[PDB]
Design a protein around this nucleic acid. Structure first.
Ligand code: MG
Ligand code: MG
Ligand code: MG
Ligand code: MG
Ligand code: MG
Ligand code: MG
Ligand code: MG
Ligand code: MG
Ligand code: MG
Ligand code: MG
Ligand code: MG
Ligand code: MG
Ligand code: MG
Ligand code: MG
Ligand code: MG
Ligand code: MG
Ligand code: MG
Ligand code: MG
Ligand code: MG
Ligand code: MG
Ligand code: MG
Ligand code: MG
Ligand code: MG
Ligand code: MG
Ligand code: MG
Ligand code: MG
Ligand code: MG
Ligand code: MG
Ligand code: MG
Ligand code: MG
Ligand code: MG
Ligand code: MG
Ligand code: MG
Ligand code: MG
Ligand code: MG
Ligand code: MG
Ligand code: MG
Ligand code: MG
Ligand code: MG
Ligand code: MG
Ligand code: MG
Ligand code: MG
Ligand code: MG
Ligand code: MG
Ligand code: MG
Ligand code: MG
Ligand code: MG
Ligand code: MG
Ligand code: MG
Ligand code: MG
Ligand code: MG
Ligand code: MG
Ligand code: MG
Ligand code: MG
Ligand code: MG
Ligand code: MG
Ligand code: MG
Ligand code: MG
Ligand code: MG
Ligand code: MG
Ligand code: MG
Ligand code: MG
Ligand code: MG
Ligand code: MG
Ligand code: MG
Ligand code: MG
Ligand code: MG
Ligand code: MG
Ligand code: MG
Ligand code: MG
Ligand code: MG
Ligand code: MG
Ligand code: MG
Ligand code: MG
Ligand code: MG
Ligand code: MG
Ligand code: MG
Ligand code: MG
Ligand code: MG
Ligand code: MG
Ligand code: MG
Ligand code: MG
Ligand code: MG
Ligand code: MG
Ligand code: MG
Ligand code: MG
Ligand code: MG
Ligand code: MG
Ligand code: MG
Ligand code: MG
Ligand code: MG
Ligand code: MG
Ligand code: MG
Ligand code: MG
Ligand code: MG
Ligand code: MG
Ligand code: MG
Ligand code: MG
Ligand code: MG
Ligand code: MG
Ligand code: MG
Ligand code: MG
Ligand code: MG
Ligand code: MG
Ligand code: MG
Ligand code: MG
Ligand code: MG
Ligand code: MG
Ligand code: MG
Ligand code: MG
Ligand code: MG
Ligand code: MG
Ligand code: MG
Ligand code: MG
Ligand code: MG
Ligand code: MG
Ligand code: MG
Ligand code: MG
Ligand code: MG
Ligand code: MG
Ligand code: MG
Ligand code: MG
Ligand code: MG
Ligand code: MG
Ligand code: MG
Ligand code: MG
Ligand code: MG
Ligand code: MG
Ligand code: MG
Ligand code: MG
Ligand code: MG
Ligand code: MG
Ligand code: MG
Ligand code: MG
Ligand code: MG
Ligand code: MG
Ligand code: MG
Ligand code: MG
Ligand code: MG
Ligand code: MG
Ligand code: MG
Ligand code: MG
Ligand code: MG
Ligand code: MG
Ligand code: MG
Ligand code: MG
Ligand code: MG
Ligand code: MG
Ligand code: MG
Ligand code: MG
Ligand code: MG
Ligand code: MG
Ligand code: MG
Ligand code: MG
Ligand code: MG
Ligand code: MG
Ligand code: MG
Ligand code: MG
Ligand code: MG
Ligand code: MG
Ligand code: MG
Ligand code: MG
Ligand code: MG
Ligand code: MG
Ligand code: MG
Ligand code: MG
Ligand code: MG
Ligand code: MG
Ligand code: MG
Ligand code: MG
Ligand code: MG
Ligand code: MG
Ligand code: ZN
Lengths: 97, 64, 84, 150, 53
RNA sequence: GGGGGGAACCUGGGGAACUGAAACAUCUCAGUACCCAGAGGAGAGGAAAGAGAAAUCGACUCCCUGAGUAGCGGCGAGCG
RNA sequence: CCGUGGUUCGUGGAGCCAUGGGGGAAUCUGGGCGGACCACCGCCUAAGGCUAAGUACUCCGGGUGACCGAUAGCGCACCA
RNA sequence: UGAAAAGCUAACCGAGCCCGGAGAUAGCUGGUUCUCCCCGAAAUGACUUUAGGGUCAGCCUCAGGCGCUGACUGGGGCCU
RNA sequence: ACCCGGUGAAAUUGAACUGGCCGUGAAGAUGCGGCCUACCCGUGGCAGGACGAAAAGACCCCGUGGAGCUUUACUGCAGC
RNA sequence: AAGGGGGCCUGACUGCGAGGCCUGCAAGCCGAGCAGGGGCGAAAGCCGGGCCUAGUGAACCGGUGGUCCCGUGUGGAAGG
């Protein structure tokens, strides 16, 4: 999953640390790492279709910012937009951001 | 580059005023139920390392 | 070719050497506390100014000079004459 | 004295040793390294101050002792440096820590504790702390011990 | 030792410190061990009793 | 207005293993080599939701020192 | 809060800075921080951005070597 | 890729070639260059994932200190 | 193949003034001992020796070497 | 008497330890005597487990009971 169009969120490298044994916290000897390796964590990207200026616009955003998509529609209601291509519109909405 | 202190030695040993090297007596960490009082007591003290091993350890603590 | 059905050895061990024996002799000068005899049982018996430890070790109780003695059937003794 | 007249004292400048330059020199062939083995190789031995051929080392078999500290590190306490009366002879009148430091005695950033070694002159010594014996010894020779709290 | 010859502490009844450690056979002498022993804390003697090691 | 190039230097995205640990997996090598994007004669950083114990300092960067200290660490090798 | 990175910090009493996931405020009587947590006493003002110098480098120009002198010195003194 | 031989993949493939990490590592083998003078070993013990490698001791050497203490021999006790 | 005219390599090579026997010696001697034998130099031939050439033995063992393969070896990752 | 029986008992002590055996280190071993508070004995005295020599495991990591020494601005607490 690439980049969230609203928040700019994107996947990062994160480790998978594998441990073993009882925690010292619980009077154990202590945790022992049996392995470290890299994985990725993706943004919860989701698809949010939406209709601006009667034309249907489709965003791809993290779930986290979905309500911000709907904020943008609310704000672009005060705007000349008609006869613009769907891309033309989306580019304009993101300009409000 | 400049030398590093051996933290293992630094945590186990001391350099006296005259450069003697002292440590705790070994052999008291556990299994003591049947160790005599005398033995647990005498191991409670410090002892001066033999010269050869002593002088090896002093090299390890150079900024001491 | 060569290395045929040989064998093994059901024994083949021993204990560490224990360094027993007389450690100071007749006429030797000694400090109180000096070990005089390491032994098993009383191969020697403690005499004048000589004590015996739990493992039969004979040591001097005074500074002095070590002296031996065979009293026949009464055994052998290590003494320590003190010095004036 | 001429430039030619200049030379070091005998002993002040030795010729460096140069191994591996032939039979007569005395360090040839092997170059004082003897025959074969780890120690003869370039690179050579593991740090001989520690390593013992893989047996548990004498150092590592001794037991650790006392507070070893822990993150977030050490705790800043007031540091005290001692000075004895014996090293207070080179003074007259007041004796402030400010003097004692400006004298090579009192190490900077240390508070001043007077210790009791040597004999006392009747003076006003101002310190952060006093030895039991020093306090009274100074009082006996009549001097004026003042305790700072700053 | 063993499951049967076990290890144990002797606790001073006066001040609850454990000052000695020894053993016993559990099968042979199954009762707690009562014994007078010097207490360094109390600086006298004291009846000490067995306490699980 | 951009594109493409530039010896090294610079920031960012990704990122090894040999090796050391006298074996080895945590650890080390090392955020190194290398790949990619970008910046420019530099680049980065920069006007405190800072430091941290003094009723103190006052953006950042660079050098010396503090210091192989405080600490980190199969509390080992080592790191710092 | 969960999964991680950064720091001397390897899960450690583990804060602080960063954030992939979930829950989700307040506008100064508000918030963050001073190594779990709580009280006290203090420091700071997050979730917008810019900024010279001091620093790094050497394709290039110059100057200088108890630097080399054609098997040396750059791979190349020469039509490399 | 293989109608299967670990075959083939630019004239040697149980893991292509090039450049790079890179002077990987090598407790192994080999090599280590002028002269004269004085001394002069060891191939033993202990521990060692140690056994053709190491750490401590033993034996060599150099400097400073001590100064008859040395090997060997005579007399005399004691030990076996 | 051999001879004459023309052109003209190679592996190898410490240096060679390079005989036999019986002994000897690191146990398989042109090279040491004692005897025996042998005028100097070549050409065409044969392969018993020079432990002949070639390839730092592939067998064997050693190295706390490497690699490919296996699994109910350990630890991990993909995948589900 | 170190063997067999009985009486009373817990020295199968706490704080130390002159001096030695052994020995590469680290370990291991014997120990008179001093103080505390005890046991048995009329007493001298003996008692710091067992006639003696095997019956064992360094350090690291953690547990449990004490203590109240450190504890990150201060008092607690976490942790040592
Ligand atoms: Mg995308
Ligand atoms: Mg990332
Ligand atoms: Mg990352
Ligand atoms: Mg850990
Ligand atoms: Mg949707
Ligand atoms: Mg339409
Ligand atoms: Mg649409
Ligand atoms: Mg939502
Ligand atoms: Mg939410
Ligand atoms: Mg518009
Ligand atoms: Mg160094
Ligand atoms: Mg260290
Ligand atoms: Mg350590
Ligand atoms: Mg010493
Ligand atoms: Mg005990
Ligand atoms: Mg004690
Ligand atoms: Mg010495
Ligand atoms: Mg040093
Ligand atoms: Mg055969
Ligand atoms: Mg057979
Ligand atoms: Mg049989
Ligand atoms: Mg024997
Ligand atoms: Mg032995
Ligand atoms: Mg033997
Ligand atoms: Mg006795
Ligand atoms: Mg004995
Ligand atoms: Mg006699
Ligand atoms: Mg007689
Ligand atoms: Mg008799
Ligand atoms: Mg008799
Ligand atoms: Mg008899
Ligand atoms: Mg008799
Ligand atoms: Mg002159
Ligand atoms: Mg001159
Ligand atoms: Mg010189
Ligand atoms: Mg020489
Ligand atoms: Mg020589
Ligand atoms: Mg040579
Ligand atoms: Mg040498
Ligand atoms: Mg050689
Ligand atoms: Mg060599
Ligand atoms: Mg080497
Ligand atoms: Mg070396
Ligand atoms: Mg080295
Ligand atoms: Mg050792
Ligand atoms: Mg060591
Ligand atoms: Mg410390
Ligand atoms: Mg710290
Ligand atoms: Mg009572
Ligand atoms: Mg029971
Ligand atoms: Mg009582
Ligand atoms: Mg541009
Ligand atoms: Mg470009
Ligand atoms: Mg970035
Ligand atoms: Mg980078
Ligand atoms: Mg990028
Ligand atoms: Mg690695
Ligand atoms: Mg190394
Ligand atoms: Mg290694
Ligand atoms: Mg190695
Ligand atoms: Mg390395
Ligand atoms: Mg990075
Ligand atoms: Mg770094
Ligand atoms: Mg770099
Ligand atoms: Mg300029
Ligand atoms: Mg600049
Ligand atoms: Mg500039
Ligand atoms: Mg700049
Ligand atoms: Mg900026
Ligand atoms: Mg900025
Ligand atoms: Mg300000
Ligand atoms: Mg602080
Ligand atoms: Mg101040
Ligand atoms: Mg203050
Ligand atoms: Mg001030
Ligand atoms: Mg103030
Ligand atoms: Mg490290
Ligand atoms: Mg570190
Ligand atoms: Mg590092
Ligand atoms: Mg680290
Ligand atoms: Mg977190
Ligand atoms: Mg990060
Ligand atoms: Mg980290
Ligand atoms: Mg860093
Ligand atoms: Mg962390
Ligand atoms: Mg920790
Ligand atoms: Mg942390
Ligand atoms: Mg907090
Ligand atoms: Mg974060
Ligand atoms: Mg988040
Ligand atoms: Mg609020
Ligand atoms: Mg409001
Ligand atoms: Mg406020
Ligand atoms: Mg702060
Ligand atoms: Mg705090
Ligand atoms: Mg809080
Ligand atoms: Mg602040
Ligand atoms: Mg701002
Ligand atoms: Mg700038
Ligand atoms: Mg130039
Ligand atoms: Mg120039
Ligand atoms: Mg020249
Ligand atoms: Mg030339
Ligand atoms: Mg020439
Ligand atoms: Mg030429
Ligand atoms: Mg040439
Ligand atoms: Mg050039
Ligand atoms: Mg030219
Ligand atoms: Mg040219
Ligand atoms: Mg060129
Ligand atoms: Mg050219
Ligand atoms: Mg085919
Ligand atoms: Mg070809
Ligand atoms: Mg090719
Ligand atoms: Mg082949
Ligand atoms: Mg294949
Ligand atoms: Mg042994
Ligand atoms: Mg081996
Ligand atoms: Mg060996
Ligand atoms: Mg070897
Ligand atoms: Mg040595
Ligand atoms: Mg010898
Ligand atoms: Mg001398
Ligand atoms: Mg003299
Ligand atoms: Mg003489
Ligand atoms: Mg004699
Ligand atoms: Mg013919
Ligand atoms: Mg013809
Ligand atoms: Mg011809
Ligand atoms: Mg010749
Ligand atoms: Mg033959
Ligand atoms: Mg011949
Ligand atoms: Mg030959
Ligand atoms: Mg001859
Ligand atoms: Mg011959
Ligand atoms: Mg002919
Ligand atoms: Mg011919
Ligand atoms: Mg012929
Ligand atoms: Mg032939
Ligand atoms: Mg070969
Ligand atoms: Mg074969
Ligand atoms: Mg190897
Ligand atoms: Mg191995
Ligand atoms: Mg090995
Ligand atoms: Mg193999
Ligand atoms: Mg009896
Ligand atoms: Mg009877
Ligand atoms: Mg009977
Ligand atoms: Mg009986
Ligand atoms: Mg009975
Ligand atoms: Mg009885
Ligand atoms: Mg009675
Ligand atoms: Mg006991
Ligand atoms: Mg004495
Ligand atoms: Mg004394
Ligand atoms: Mg010893
Ligand atoms: Mg033993
Ligand atoms: Mg009594
Ligand atoms: Mg009686
Ligand atoms: Mg009585
Ligand atoms: Mg007893
Ligand atoms: Mg018995
Ligand atoms: Mg027994
Ligand atoms: Mg054992
Ligand atoms: Mg360890
Ligand atoms: Mg513990
Ligand atoms: Mg601990
Ligand atoms: Mg406290
Ligand atoms: Mg505190
Ligand atoms: Mg606090
Ligand atoms: Mg506290
Ligand atoms: Mg505690
Ligand atoms: Zn008590």
């Amino acid at each position: 999953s690439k980049v969230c169009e609203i928040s700019g969120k994107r996947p990062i490298v994160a480790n998978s640390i594998q441990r073993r044994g009882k925690a010292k916290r619980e009077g154990g000897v202590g945790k022992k790492t049996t392995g470290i390796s890299k994985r990725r964590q993706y943004p919860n990207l989701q698809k949010v279709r939406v209709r601006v200026a009667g034309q249907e616009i489709t965003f791809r955003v993290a779930a986290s910012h979905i309500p911000k998509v709907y904020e943008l529609v609310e704000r672009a209601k005060g705007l000349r937009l008609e006869g613009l291509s769907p891309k033309e519109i989306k580019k304009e909405l993101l300009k409000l951001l | 580059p400049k030398m590093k202190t051996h933290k293992g030695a630094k945590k186990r040993v001391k350099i006296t005023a005259s450069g003697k090297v002292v440590a705790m007596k070994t052999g008291k960490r556990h299994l003591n139920w049947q160790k005599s009082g005398k033995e647990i007591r005498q191991k409670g003290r410090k002892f001066v390392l033999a010269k050869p091993e002593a002088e090896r350890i002093k090299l390890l603590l150079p900024y001491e | 070719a060569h290395k045929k059905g040989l064998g093994s050895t059901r024994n083949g061990r021993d204990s560490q050497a224990k360094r027993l024996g007389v450690k100071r002799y007749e006429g030797q000068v000694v400090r109180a506390g000096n070990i005089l005899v390491r032994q098993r049982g009383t191969r020697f018996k403690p005499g004048k100014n000589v004590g015996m430890g739990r493992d039969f070790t004979l040591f001097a109780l005074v500074d002095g000079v070590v002296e031996f003695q065979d009293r026949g059937r009464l055994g052998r003794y290590v003494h320590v004459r003190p010095l004036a | 004295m001429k430039l030619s007249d200049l030379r070091p004292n005998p002993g002040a400048n030795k010729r460096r040793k140069r191994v591996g330059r032939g039979p007569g020199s005395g360090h040839g062939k092997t170059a004082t390294r003897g025959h074969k083995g780890q120690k003869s190789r370039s690179g050579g031995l593991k740090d001989p101050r520690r390593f013992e051929g893989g047996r548990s080392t004498t150092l590592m078999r001794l037991p650790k002792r006392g507070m070893q500290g822990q993150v977030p590190g050490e705790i800043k306490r007031p540091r005290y440096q001692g000075v004895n009366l014996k090293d207070l002879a080179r003074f007259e009148g007041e004796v402030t820590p400010e003097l004692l430091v400006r004298a090579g005695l009192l190490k900077k950033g240390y508070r001043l504790k007077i210790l009791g070694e040597g004999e006392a002159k009747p003076l006003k010594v101002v310190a952060h702390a006093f030895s039991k014996s020093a306090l009274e010894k100074l009082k006996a020779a009549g001097g004026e011990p003042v305790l700072l709290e700053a | 030792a063993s499951e049967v010859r076990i290890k144990l502490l002797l606790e001073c009844t006066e001040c609850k410190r454990r000052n000695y450690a020894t053993e016993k056979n559990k099968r042979n002498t199954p009762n707690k061990l009562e014994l007078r022993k010097y207490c360094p804390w109390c600086r006298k003697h004291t009846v000490h009793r067995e306490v699980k090691i």
